[PDB]
Design a protein around this ligand. Structure first.
Ligand SMILES: O=C(Nc1cncc2ccccc12)[C@@H]1CNS(=O)(=O)c2ccc(Cl)cc21
Ligand SMILES: O=C(Nc1cncc2ccccc12)[C@@H]1CNS(=O)(=O)c2ccc(Cl)cc21
Ligand SMILES: [Cl-]
Lengths: 298, 305
């Protein structure tokens, strides 16, 4: 029993965090094999023109108490790749993956190449993440684990005026219409991740919370009109298929659960909570629910 | 900016998790130096759980009855002893991944990270608090016994909890790393129930200070309160009494935001009376009590917005 916002064990990622310093700027880097990946804004804009003036020795890379020697540098989109003289002996099995909005991941928040905390979060539909980052956190990474393989999906670049965060995949491509510069940028109007709320309703049923269930079912068309009114993301047939296993485990059809969500949207919780929350939670995917309600280890 | 339920990086603890098997029972163990620590109920059957005589079950065991597995390597048990509700298995190999560590017994209201494990393999990490009724609202399935709670302030890991059992309400009970249970619990399958739980008042106040640091003041009011009048109201909402120690502990956050502890207490009094009226505080529609004053100072900026 119990349902918590659970992050992946961060150990495989901790052994990759380094500190990158260029002039007065200090941020975090990801050391995998003989390459350190970090936000290109560490050199700050006309980035290729600023980088051509730099030499390898201008980049100071520190791994714990050891200084790594930079022997090459190149830029890939908004990420800077620093070739170092030593391959990371702690390099795990890894992939660079680009995630979609609604997908979740663990963030290992770091400062000065030293990990300070781990939390779970989701890529919002507006491509921002509601993280917890202070100055110096740039270069902190987001990841998932599949058995023994770490899939790096996010590198932190910036904070927006509303306190939300923006960053890139590990190939330097931003999530969202953001740019790495000091300019007027704002997060778009956000929406609720509907498939995730439904998965969390299934998790509540598994944990013995059924007060919100009713005898009614609905159609995908009728429900999407309701979702559009409450700033909820549209629910697709793919989402319904993905929720199949949870529907079979609890005996509650996806459109049956949709009618419960419809009634919660039109009428509220009436002083009640679901899994200790007075709001509808959307940062647990269907897979996160299945994994936490059947202990998958790494 | 931002405020999340944040756990400590678990790497230092992952390198200590092992699997302990005794007959048909399999659970987790903590390998530090040449000792594996695990719940003593690993020597019990399901039948034994009603009224187990641990001393009588343990005397019938030899070192080779305990199978300890660290990754793909079997560790050799060369000694065993019981300390309260923990079993200590002396092994032939010291853990090369043993971090700098301490065993600390925490008080209710204190928070810690939990590395949930199954078969000596870590599956997830989450942050939680020792409730005033000495239980924890964890996320544990069968096989999680032996999973540990810890804090890593600076570079030393302070082990504070080892998981032992789930109570009928779905909440969890366990011990410190010396085998002493938190709460009036026993490692028996006897009728045991968690006491009525209360809200950790000092933690809710700390989280209200965190909201002010992050730029939100909608809930403040022009009133103050005496400590006694605050407690008379708070206890009607099942809130823990606020002591002078709690007021002293909130001193730094009061100085950082310019809001006196008893003025923040007055704001809490009003929040309990009125509810939130469709508003949220740090993305929550409930009053959060699983962030200590120390957690807020650690995660929040030193400059208020
Ligand atoms: O956004 C940025 N950093 C930060 C990231 N996370 C949390 C922070 C909390 C406080 C202050 C800065 C934070 C920087 C500097 N600020 S900036 O000059 O506006 C900027 C602009 C672009 C890029 Cl890609 C980066 C940046
Ligand atoms: O509580 C116990 N195990 C578990 C611990 N954590 C989460 C679980 C979730 C599902 C099922 C079992 C779980 C066991 C067995 N059940 S028992 O015989 O009641 C029991 C009693 C005491 C002691 Cl110390 C231990 C136990
Ligand atoms: Cl304590």
């Amino acid at each position: 029993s119990g349902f918590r916002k659970m992050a992946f064990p961060s150990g495989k990622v901790e052994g990759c965090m380094v500190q990158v310093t260029c002039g007065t700027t200090t941020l975090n880097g990801l050391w995998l094999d003989d390459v350190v990946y970090c936000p290109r804004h560490v050199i700050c804009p006309n980035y290729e023109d600023l980088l051509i003036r730099k030499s390898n020795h201008n980049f100071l890379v520190q791994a714990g108490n050891v200084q790594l020697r930079v022997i090459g540098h190149s830029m890939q989109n908004c990420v800077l790749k620093l070739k170092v003289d030593t391959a990371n002996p702690k390099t795990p099995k890894y992939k660079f993956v680009r995630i979609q909005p609604g997908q979740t991941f663990s963030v290992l928040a770091c400062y000065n190449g030293s990990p300070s905390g781990v939390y779970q979060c989701a890529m919002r539909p507006n491509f921002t993440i509601k993280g917890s980052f202070l100055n110096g956190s740039c270069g902190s990474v987001g990841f998932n684990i599949d058995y023994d393989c770490v899939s790096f999906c996010y590198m932190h670049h910036m904070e927006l005026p509303t306190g939300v965060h923006a960053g890139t995949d590990l190939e330097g491509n931003f999530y969202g219409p953001f740019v790495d510069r000091q300019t007027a940028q704002a997060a778009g109007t956000d929406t609720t991740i509907t498939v995730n709320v439904l998965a969390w309703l299934y998790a509540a049923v598994i944990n013995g919370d059924r007060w919100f269930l009713n005898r009614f079912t609905t159609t995908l068309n009728d429900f999407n009109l309701v979702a559009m009114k409450y700033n909820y993301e549209p629910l697709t047939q793919d989402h319904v298929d993905i929720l199949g296993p949870l529907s079979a485990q609890t005996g509650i059809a996806v459109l049956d659960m949709c009618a419960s969500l419809k009634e919660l949207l039109q009428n509220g919780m009436n002083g009640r909570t679901i899994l200790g929350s007075a709001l509808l939670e959307d940062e647990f995917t269907p897979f996160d629910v299945v994994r936490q309600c059947s202990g998958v280890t790494f």
